């Protein structure tokens, strides 16, 4: 069943993922998530360090995700259905929330200098 969940604060300007799906993800992070790079498109600032890009294989998707957040996105980590891991990247602030047994289909959000928020569209199993 398809649903969505917002994480983080109220600031920044809105962005969207590609629209249908999600082919690759990288982040910039320090103490917080500075940026999320979705399908090669940058959303957020130029601070922090750039992660390697995670590129989803055929039949591969985000299945479990842990996000630390307060007013911003502090940390992102995920696992896929193929057992691959991304992160954790970011700091230790905020509070943790986990999507468990999902299939993420799109990531939208809001950003300025940092990644303020994410709105994750996923199938909840």
UniProtKB/Swiss-Prot annotation:
<dbReference type="GO" id="GO:0042802">
    <property type="term" value="F:identical protein binding"/>
</dbReference>
<comment type="function">
    <text>Mixed specificity lectin with anti-HIV activity. Binds to HIV envelope glycoproteins, including exterior membrane glycoprotein gp120, and inhibits viral entry into cells. Binding to gp120 is dependent on gp120 being glycosylated, and is inhibited by mannose, glucose and N-acetylglucosamine.</text>
</comment>
<dbReference type="GO" id="GO:0005536">
    <property type="term" value="F:D-glucose binding"/>
</dbReference>
<comment type="similarity">
    <text>Belongs to the jacalin lectin family.</text>
</comment>
<keyword id="KW-0465">Mannose-binding</keyword>
<dbReference type="InterPro" id="IPR036404">
    <property type="entry name" value="Jacalin-like_lectin_dom_sf"/>
</dbReference>
<feature type="domain" description="Jacalin-type lectin">
    <location>
        <begin position="1"/>
        <end position="124"/>
    </location>
</feature>
<dbReference type="Pfam" id="PF01419">
    <property type="entry name" value="Jacalin"/>
</dbReference>
<dbReference type="GO" id="GO:0005537">
    <property type="term" value="F:D-mannose binding"/>
</dbReference>
<dbReference type="GO" id="GO:0030246">
    <property type="term" value="F:carbohydrate binding"/>
</dbReference>
<protein>
    <recommendedName>
        <fullName>Griffithsin</fullName>
    </recommendedName>
</protein>
<dbReference type="GO" id="GO:0046871">
    <property type="term" value="F:N-acetylgalactosamine binding"/>
</dbReference>
<keyword id="KW-0430">Lectin</keyword>
<dbReference type="InterPro" id="IPR001229">
    <property type="entry name" value="Jacalin-like_lectin_dom"/>
</dbReference>
């Amino acid at each position: 069943s398809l649903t969505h969940r917002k994480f983080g604060g109220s600031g920044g300007s809105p962005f969207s993922g590609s629209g249908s799906g999600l082919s690759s993800i990288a982040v910039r992070s320090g103490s917080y998530l500075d940026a999320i790079i979705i399908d090669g498109v940058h959303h957020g600032g130029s601070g922090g360090n750039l992660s390697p890009t995670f590129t989803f294989g055929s039949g591969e998707y985000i299945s479990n995700m842990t996000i630390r957040s307060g007013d911003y996105i502090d940390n992102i980590s995920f696992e896929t259905n193929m057992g691959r891991r991304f992160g954790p990247y970011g700091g230790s602030g905020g509070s943790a929330n986990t999507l468990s047994n999902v299939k993420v289909i799109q990531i939208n959000g809001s950003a300025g200098d940092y990644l303020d928020s994410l709105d994750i569209y996923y199938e909840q199993y």
